[PDB]
Amino acid sequence: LSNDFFGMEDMDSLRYEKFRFMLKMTVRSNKPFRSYDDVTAAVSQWDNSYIGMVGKRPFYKIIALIGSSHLQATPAVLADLNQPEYYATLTGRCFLPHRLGLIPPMFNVSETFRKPFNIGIYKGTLDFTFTVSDDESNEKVPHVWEYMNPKYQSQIQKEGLKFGLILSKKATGTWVLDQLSPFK
């Protein structure tokens, strides 16, 4: 029931970077996550080690955060309460406001990350496929934050820090990726 556990709804200077993305994210855990901050802790472990495209890493972190908010438990947890699995898929186009400087062009090639996670009470695996590329079309786009599940939109700044994202909203009108943490 959505009341006790996360993801059970289904069961029941400054630059703007314009990009498009696709994500497919699977999380497999030993026990069902009780809350969204348990989920983000697990998901955030995806790049504890990283050999993907250097220039894409910030965008991957961002869409991993966004995508996490959409994770939903599959029936795996009803077959076996001890084999919880969660899935999310999302595609979009948007602006990322950031202070990271010039971003080299990004091409339409996917990268897959398959990694363990261990956050104490919870442990398991992550299987993420991300695609991020420049969006050259003339269609108008939202800010990336508009793709966050509204249920969890209020938790953006705090949960972002788990991903190494230092986000602020001081007099800009929108969340800005001010910097990436050297510690994560």
Residue numbers in the entry: 41 to 52, 58 to 229
Article passage:
In addition to its structural roles, M has been implicated in controlling the balance between transcription and replication of the viral genome, in promoting budding, and in modulating host-cell transcription, -translation and -apoptosis. To further investigate the role of the N terminus and hydrophobic surface-exposed loop and to investigate the structural conservation of M across Rhabdoviridae, we solved the structures of full-length M from VSV serotype New Jersey (VSVNJ) and from the lyssavirus Lagos bat virus (LBV).
The structure of VSVNJ M was solved by SeMet single-wavelength anomalous dispersion phasing and refined to 1.83 Å resolution with residuals R/Rfree = 0.157/0.179. VSVNJ M forms a globular domain with a central α helix sandwiched on one side by an extensive 5-stranded β sheet and on the other by two α helices and a smaller two-stranded β sheet that is very similar to the thermolysin-resistant core of M (Mth) from VSV serotype Indiana (VSVInd), with 0.9 Å root-mean-squared displacement (rmsd) over 156 Cα atoms. Residues 121–128, disordered in the VSVInd Mth structure, are observed in the structure of VSVNJ M with residues 121–124 forming a short stretch of α helix (α2.5). The N-terminal 57 residues of VSVNJ M do not form part of this globular domain. While residues 1–40 and 53–57 are not well ordered and could not be modeled in electron density, residues 41–52 are located in strong electron density bound in a deep hydrophobic pocket formed by the loops between sheet β1 and helix α1, the region between helices α2 and α2.5 (including sheet β2), and the stretch of 3–10 helix immediately preceding helix α3. F46 is central to the interaction: the side chain of F46 sits deep in the hydrophobic pocket lined by the side chains of residues Y81, V84, L116, Y131, Y197 and the backbone between residues 114 and 116. The interaction of the globular domain with the N-terminal peptide of an adjacent molecule in the crystal gives rise to non-covalently linked linear polymers of VSVNJ M monomers. In VSVNJ M this loop has shifted toward the interacting N-terminal residues: the Cα atom of K196 moves 9.5 Å from its position in VSVInd Mth and residues 195–200 form a stretch of 3–10 helix. Our structure reveals that the Rae-1 binding site on VSV M partially overlaps with the N-terminal self-association motif.
